[PDB]
Ligand binder design. Structure first.
Ligand SMILES: [Mg+2]
Ligand SMILES: [Zn+2]
Lengths: 60, 217, 344, 181, 79, 56, 41, 55, 137, 143, 192, 42
RNA sequence: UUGUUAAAACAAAUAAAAUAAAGUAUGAAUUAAUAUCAAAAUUUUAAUAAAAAUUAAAAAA
RNA sequence: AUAUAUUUAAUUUUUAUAAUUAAUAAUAAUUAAUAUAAGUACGCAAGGAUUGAUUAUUGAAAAAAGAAAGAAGAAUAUAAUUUA
């Protein structure tokens, strides 16, 4: 790792930067409420999942 | 009348951790002082010659150099002055050869700072807090003088030079950019040597030689 | 400050009775030459001057008779002894903390502060060091994050053995004045700091590696130019200098981050002396786990930090009382919040 | 910055163990929060490589891979063992979607529960071989499942050397030659 | 909750004060409402025929030890 | 991991076999003089994509 | 802790630190036993 | 402006640390206690013994 | 090596040797059996009035080696309860607050009826430093 | 002339992510949340995203002379349990004025109360469509 | 209503701590929890015989396995307990190696008071210390049985859990002693 | 042909710059060395 | 961001995120007066002067 | 609208530990307006003071000693969350 040494980052802790005060993905829970998630006309995944979720919630 | 908070698992007599003691005010100052005998320290130094054992014994005797006696001090200095020679370099312990820049430079092990701390502790013990031990015992005077001559203290460049054809300047050189900060300009034995020469000049002002009358030809 | 030439230090400018050295005993008259021949032809050797005698006598009488009226004039003699905390001379060593996490708090006025919590695991005064015994050249090394023996390198475990202090992970040196010492092995409780206190912190920001000149300096990196060449302001003659080389300091692409960053004068928000936590309303750039170092701010706005109007520090270092037990004491009981402050 | 895989469909009464991942889709990256991305031609190519690799791993119980493919393969094998321990119909549908061979899907779902009933995590095992690939001078790693001889269709097999032919069954230790597949 | 190791009186008071936020929670609810109750944690209780908060509270020390160490439920002690 | 290292490994193997055949012991063998001097040479031209000649 | 050697500094057999004055309040240590010749070489 | 470089400028590269650590450097090796082969610590063999226990 | 760099590189060991020679005179006293710390003459002339008729105070502080050794060895006393409990003030209160309102004058707009003990606006603005006699805040 | 950007100083490069285990950081978060609850800056909440999403809420921002009241519909809740993080996404419409606020819990000068933990996804969808139509109309009138 | 909401919050805040119990002496062994599973039942009988209480009074809580750590740390409650303590050996420069990795708490009847609990804890601690010393000196009594056949080698007396906190002010309103007594009487009636 | 190595000492180099009073070069004599005192008053 | 149309769509273009384009072996060609080439500033001699002189001191990859 | 030399930006990989020495005055010419300073001197009236503190940018400035062919992660941010 001497040729890459001047460019690549170097760390002793192994690259562990985890803040237990910030908001995590499991705490956010579901991103479909975000505007991008339900108006992302460019992702079949986003469109299909948000449609399925809204239909399931309305049915329930 | 108190009871402990947990059970103490049994242990053999040889595997105990005796020999040290915490300071008086433990809940505020947890300094650890050694109470081992100088004979034990010398036996460890002479039986286990590993560098870690050497530095541990040196630190123990440097912490115990305060309340010991003249005979124990002479014994300690005679046991310490064994691996040193006058022909070779005095206090050189160069182990690592770093050639990061153009020409290489040598980094020693912990034995050099161990010896430096020992000399400093001896200076503090025989100069500042007990200024009469040298004038009282001329044997300890000559012993510490011969030890300080055997380890080349007044030329710390020979501590860091590896080949006599290219002497080192690790101690006498220093630049404000940040090079040679901890290693340059070490006041190792200057104060002790000044105290000794002042003791030898005390005769001219005292009109009668105390040290020179106590010592032998 | 007010300029005061040394030549203006004559007795006609002194606010108190000017006292000449005069050997062992202070006198009110210049030292008369013992050799009479040394007397200069116009030098008027004064042995008794009724003016100065009366002035000094009345001054001493008033000082000894009305202590309440002349209390401020008592600093002319019996100065504060050495060892007590001084407002302009006593600086104390800081501590070594670990950036724990981030949260947000709110003051009573309604302002939101995005704070970061640092953790001070085991602060212990490890070493003292002075170079050749000069003035103001002494400092105290404090160690932190006690570790086992199998962790550190051999050459640093050797130093910790030589010191006798329990082997710490990190060790930072603070330059202090000799009257602020603390014995080797002294535990430093976090209550050493106060909540309404300004602190200067030093850490290492995160590492981004080699980054472009745009990302390094933002908009500043795109345009970099400096010309110290002479140029004609008026068309009278012809003469200039060619900028041959590139001047040092040219903003280019290179290493970004991973440097020693120091914030100066951030106020403390809250202190938890059960888990050894300190909260600062400033969001830092460093990662989680960077050993920050906290030190006391000297002065701000021409005003010293430690004074009677703001408060007295825990000089030299805070020592808890005996009957206090942090184990029995709860977490909610160990909370010290700073007085309110508005910044908008 | 946001992962659409968090948008949950057909939610169960109980929250999933991961609750944020696929968990087969790994979102390869270089920060420690993600998996090491082995060099490919596109993220789709990377996913296809991972799919074929985990399929072959499930098929032949071992895989020798070079470069950063070994940690990715190990974590994906761990996720597959987690799916097998779950044993739900949706989990099986997802594994059949992600894998190339439904026969290997069935083999995994049949053999892995009995195999890893008595284990919590770190089911696979990666061993860095001292021998590097000749064409690239890249390190190689042997990734295999740990519980081979306690309960599995493979048992008492020798992996120190390959068979006489690559279409013959693998070597079998003489101690357990009586077992049948 | 991320207690870890041993449940403390702080976590006890947390659960007590959060019990107010749910008005519909009855002692007969499904075991999934409890905290740290994952799929693998609750399926073992279903195997042992534990469908109720009352039952999972009446669970014995040896039984929860078996559920944690032999079955593989991580936070069964917290549950 | 160097082609030169592989070639000199082959050379060391052959030299050890020859020394054994001559009658020298195996444990006390040491390289005394290893050198290389330029030898033969070949020149190869080749066409590339869209018709460019390259020399090697 | 396969890589971790008890008492040695960073798992190095030639840097024995056990049964010395290394004050360590919270962490334990192992008593001393003289290493063999085949262990060091 | 490019010109032929004297032999001294061709030997300046070996003074830097980049050339020394790349080409000319020895290995720390020992004998695999199960294979009796030279082995670097950290990289193991394919054999069943070397995978279960690390030699 | 610049001119100043070479000058300092060749003079710094000489400066240290000169300081050692200076401390040798101090060690002369402890050598004769009478260990005596260095004495410094306390200067009573440190409060001056400048040319522009304003007060200047010089600060001279001394270091005691015995007190240094005492602070090195003996632990400091227990910190004061009020000192560690009462937080430090954030804003520095002015030397003279302008209240602008006093209940003593019957007509508050009467400028001649306000008591003299209340500080003025001129003091409120100019008094940013302590008075001539008192030096510390 | 020359300067250095990186520092290999041991005290700066050493990390404590391995020793972060002895600090009960989650317990500190819960203690801060409980202190806020006992002071009254926030009130504990236990709802899920789909349950709270679509429930009317009233928020009073205290302000002399008149505290400003605002009745809106909860569009998104960032946290399911009480914490110092919190976060709520409300949408309120005045007379010909729509607005989307992100209310953080724990502000003493801000008292927000959801009128019912139960929510109507139909009304949520209605409010979402109204907000999206207003946003699109604003963008179209701008550009 | 906000008033009644703060009232029910104050009620649940001043409510007595349910499901909380103080342990007498936390026992610890070096074997694994999966091995202690099969012997945990006889531990109750042997502890009853050690405490000289009627059979069936000792209750063992959930078995815990202190998480093994390559980098030891003392402050964690999941840390493996050490055979030595600072109060035991102040003048020792380090601690003795790990003694316990599988732990279990021991409870008496709920009617017994804290003085009886701490007395029984001290008795158990002393008896186990004597038993371990006799084991070391040698290589019938319940202590010797627990030490030999069950592999128990650690006992701890846990400090009182002070993480609990009194509610001096709920919802921004101070708690009066009359209201606290009313809530306490209500909870006592509900328990009755 | 004489040759001075390019790898010379430097002020940033840790080895540092030497003292000619301490050096032992060929062209540096130390036997015939006398000490003179020079007062610069005026 | 701009422009066109209508009461959102299209086309342009860059600056943030994301994707790729090796640390492996194979290996040319432009160029080549040259001292182990003169870091810089000042002054000057027949046109950039890297030609000369005076200060000054410019490490290696 | 050609790969060059000088000059610059970096790097030479945990170094327990900054700088009494190159940045030879100053990061603004040690500021500095501002509500409150003042419905007030000065002005017949109209109108109109000098002025420095809390509101701001004011800490001005370089972290050079230890054994080196994996990913500085055994990688899904836990220094092994039980593990056959
Ligand atoms: Mg290094
Ligand atoms: Zn092998």
């Amino acid at each position: 790792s001497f040729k890459r040494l001047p460019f690549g980052r170097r760390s002793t802790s192994g690259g562990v930067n985890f803040n237990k005060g910030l908001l995590t993905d499991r705490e956010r829970g579901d991103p479909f409420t975000e505007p991008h998630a339900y108006r992302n006309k460019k992702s079949i995944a986003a469109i299909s999942k948000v449609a399925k979720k809204q239909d399931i919630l309305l049915r329930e | 009348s108190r009871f402990p908070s947990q059970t103490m698992s049994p242990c053999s007599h040889e595997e105990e951790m005796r020999g040290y003691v915490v300071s008086r005010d433990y809940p505020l100052i947890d300094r650890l002082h050694c109470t081992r005998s100088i004979e034990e320290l010398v036996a460890q130094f002479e039986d286990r010659p590993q560098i870690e054992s050497r530095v541990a014994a040196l630190a123990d005797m440097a912490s115990t150099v305060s309340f010991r006696s003249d005979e124990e001090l002479l014994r300690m200095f005679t046991a310490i002055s064994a691996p040193f020679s006058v022909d070779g370099r005095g206090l050189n312990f160069l182990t690592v050869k770093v050639s990061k820049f153009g020409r290489p430079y040598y980094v020693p092990n912990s034995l050099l700072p161990a010896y430096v701390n020992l000399v400093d502790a001896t200076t503090i013990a025989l100069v500042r807090e007990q200024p009469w031990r040298l004038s009282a015992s001329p044997a300890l005077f000559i012993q510490v003088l011969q030890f300080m001559a055997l380890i080349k203290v007044f030329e710390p460049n020979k501590w860091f030079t590896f080949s006599d054809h290219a002497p080192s300047n690790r101690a006498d050189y220093r630049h404000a950019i940040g090079v040679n900060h901890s290693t340059a300009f070490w006041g190792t034995g200057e104060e002790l040597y000044d105290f000794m020469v002042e003791l030898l000049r005390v005769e001219d002002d005292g009109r009668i030689p105390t040290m020179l009358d106590l010592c032998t030809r | 400050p007010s300029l005061m030439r040394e030549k203006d230090r004559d007795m006609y400018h002194c606010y108190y009775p000017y006292l000449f050295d005069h050997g062992d005993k202070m006198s009110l008259y210049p030292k008369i030459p013992e050799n009479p021949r040394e007397w200069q032809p116009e030098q008027l050797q004064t042995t008794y001057d009724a003016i100065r005698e009366d002035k000094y006598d009345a001054f001493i009488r008033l000082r000894e008779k009305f202590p309440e009226l002349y209390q401020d004039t008592r600093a002319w003699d019996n100065p504060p002894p050495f060892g007590e905390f001084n407002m302009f001379y006593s600086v104390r060593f800081g501590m070594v903390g670990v950036k724990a996490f981030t949260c947000k708090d709110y003051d009573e006025l309604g302002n939101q502060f995005d704070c970061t919590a640092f953790w001070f695991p085991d602060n212990q005064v490890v070493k003292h060091s002075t170079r050749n015994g000069e003035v103001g050249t002494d400092k105290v090394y404090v160690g932190a994050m006690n570790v086992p023996v199998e962790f550190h390198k051999p050459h640093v475990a050797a130093f910790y053995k030589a010191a006798g202090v329990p082997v710490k992970h990190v060790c930072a040196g603070f330059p202090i004045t000799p009257d602020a010492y603390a014995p080797v092995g002294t535990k430093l409780d976090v209550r050493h700091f106060k909540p309404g206190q300004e602190v200067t912190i030093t850490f290492q920001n995160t590492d981004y590696g080699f980054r472009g000149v745009m990302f390094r300096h933002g908009f500043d990196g795109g345009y970099v130019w400096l010309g110290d060449s002479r140029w004609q302001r008026r068309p009278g003659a012809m003469g200039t200098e060619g900028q041959k080389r590139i001047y040092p300091g040219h903003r280019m692409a290179g290493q970004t981050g991973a440097a020693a960053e120091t914030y100066q004068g951030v106020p403390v928000w809250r202190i938890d002396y059960k888990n050894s936590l300190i909260y600062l309303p400033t969001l830092l750039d460093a990662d989680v786990g960077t050993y920050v170092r906290f030190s006391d701010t000297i002065n701000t706005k021409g005003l010293t930090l430690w004074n009677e109007h703001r408060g007295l520090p825990a000089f030299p270092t805070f020592i808890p009382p005996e009957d206090e037990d942090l184990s029995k004491l709860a977490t909610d009981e160990c909370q010290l919040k700073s007085p309110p402050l508005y910044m908008y | 910055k946001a992962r659409y895989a968090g948008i949950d469909d057909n939610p169960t009464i109980t929250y999933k163990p991961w609750d944020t991942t696929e968990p087969l889709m790994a979102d390869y990256g270089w920060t420690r929060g993600k998996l090491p991305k082995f060099r490919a031609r596109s993220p789709f190519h990377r996913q296809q490589i991972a799919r074929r690799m985990v399929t072959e791993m499930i098929r032949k119980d071992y895989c020798i891979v070079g470069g950063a493919r070994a940690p990715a393969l190990r974590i994906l094998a761990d996720h597959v063992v987690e799916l097998a321990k779950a044993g739900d119909t949706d989990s099986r549908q997802q594994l059949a979607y992600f894998l190339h061979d439904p026969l290997m899907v069935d083999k995994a779902f049949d053999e892995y529960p009995r195999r890893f009933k008595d284990m919590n995590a770190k089911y696979a095992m990666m061993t860095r071989l001292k021998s590097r690939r000749r064409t690239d001078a890249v390190a190689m790693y042997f990734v295999e499942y740990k519980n081979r001889d306690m309960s599995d269709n493979h048992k008492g097999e020798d992996y120190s050397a390959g068979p006489e032919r690559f279409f013959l069954p693998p070597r079998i230790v003489e101690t357990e030659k009586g077992i049948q597949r | 909750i991320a207690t870890g190791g041993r449940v403390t009186n702080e976590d006890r008071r947390w659960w007590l004060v959060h019990l107010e936020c749910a008005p519909d929670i009855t002692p007969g609810t499904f075991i999934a409402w409890l905290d740290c109750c994952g799929t693998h944690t609750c399926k073992k209780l279903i195997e042992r025929n534990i469908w109720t908060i009352e039952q999972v509270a009446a669970l014995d020390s040896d039984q929860v030890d078996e559920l944690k160490y032999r079955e593989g439920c991580l936070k069964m002690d917290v549950v | 991991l160097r082609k030169g290292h592989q070639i000199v490994f082959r050379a060391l193997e052959m030299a050890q076999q020859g020394a054994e055949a001559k009658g020298l012991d195996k444990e006390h063998l040491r390289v005394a003089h290893i050198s290389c001097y330029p030898g033969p040479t070949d020149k190869q031209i080749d066409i590339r994509s869209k018709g460019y000649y390259a020399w090697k | 802790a396969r890589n971790l050697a008890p008492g040695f500094s960073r798992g190095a057999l030639k840097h024995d630190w056990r049964a010395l004055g290394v004050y360590t309040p919270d962490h334990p240590q192992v008593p001393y036993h003289p290493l063999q010749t085949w262990m060091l070489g | 402006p490019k010109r032929k470089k004297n032999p001294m400028q061709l030997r300046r590269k070996v003074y830097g640390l980049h050339f020394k650590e790349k080409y000319l450097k020895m290995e720390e090796w020992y004998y695999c206690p199960l294979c009796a082969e030279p082995k670097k610590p950290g990289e193991w063999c394919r054999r069943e013994d070397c995978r279960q226990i690390k030699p | 090596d610049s001119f100043k760099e070479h000058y300092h590189r060749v003079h710094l060991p000489r400066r240290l040797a000169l300081q050692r020679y200076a401390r040798q005179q101090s060690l002369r006293n402890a050598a004769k059996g009478n260990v005596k710390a260095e004495e410094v003459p306390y200067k009573y002339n440190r409060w001056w009035v400048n040319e522009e008729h304003e007060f200047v105070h010089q600060y001279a502080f001394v270091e005691d080696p015995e007190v240094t050794k005492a602070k090195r060895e003996t632990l400091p006393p227990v910190t004061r309860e009020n000192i560690w409990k009462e937080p430090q003030q954030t804003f520095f209160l002015p030397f003279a607050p302008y209240v602008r309102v006093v209940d003593y004058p019957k007509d508050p707009d009467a400028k001649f009826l306000k008591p003299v003990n209340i500080p003025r606006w001129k003091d409120y603005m100019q008094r940013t430093k302590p008075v001539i006699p008192r030096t510390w805040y | 002339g020359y300067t250095r950007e990186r520092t290999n100083r041991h005290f700066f490069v050493a990390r404590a992510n391995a020793f972060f285990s002895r600090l009960p950081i989650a317990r500190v978060q819960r203690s801060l949340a409980m202190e806020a609850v006992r002071e009254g800056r926030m009130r504990p909440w236990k709802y899920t995203k789909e349950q709270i999403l679509g429930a009317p809420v009233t928020c009073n921002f205290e302000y002399n002379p008149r505290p400003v009241r605002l009745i809106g519909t909860v569009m998104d809740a960032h946290t399911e349990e009480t914490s110092i993080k919190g976060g709520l996404k409300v949408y309120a419409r005045n007379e010909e004025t729509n607005m989307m606020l992100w209310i953080p819990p724990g502000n003493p000068k801000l008292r927000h109360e959801v009128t019912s933990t139960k929510g109507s996804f139909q009304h949520y969808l209605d409010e979402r469509d109204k907000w999206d139509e207003a946003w699109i109309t604003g963008r179209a009138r701008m550009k | 209503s906000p008033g009644t909401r703060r009232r029910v919050l104050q009620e649940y805040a001043l409510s007595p701590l349910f499901g909380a119990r103080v342990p007498c002496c936390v026992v610890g062994t070096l074997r694994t929890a999966k091995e202690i599973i099969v012997l945990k039942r006889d531990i109750q009988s042997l502890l009853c015989e050690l405490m000289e209480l009627p059979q069936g009074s000792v209750t063992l809580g959930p078995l815990q396995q202190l998480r093994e750590m390559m980098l030891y740390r003392h402050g964690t409650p999941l840390s493996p307990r050490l055979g030595d303590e600072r109060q035991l050996n102040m003048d020792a420069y380090a601690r003795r190696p790990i003694a316990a990795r599988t732990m279990m708490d021991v409870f008496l009847a709920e009617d017994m008071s804290l003085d009886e609990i701490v007395n029984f804890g001290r008795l158990s601690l002393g008896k186990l210390q004597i038993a371990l010393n006799n084991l070391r000196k040698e290589n019938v009594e319940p202590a010797q049985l627990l030490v030999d056949r069950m592999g128990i080698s650690y006992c701890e007396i846990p400090s009182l859990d002070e993480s609990d906190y009194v509610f001096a002010e709920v919802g921004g309103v101070a708690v009066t002693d009359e209201e606290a007594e009313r809530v306490a009487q209500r909870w006592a009636e509900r328990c009755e | 042909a004489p040759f001075k190595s390019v790898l010379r000492r430097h002020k940033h180099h840790p080895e540092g710059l030497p003292l000619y009073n301490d050096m032992s070069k060929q062209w540096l004599c130390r036997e015939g060395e006398r000490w003179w005192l020079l007062d610069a008053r005026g």
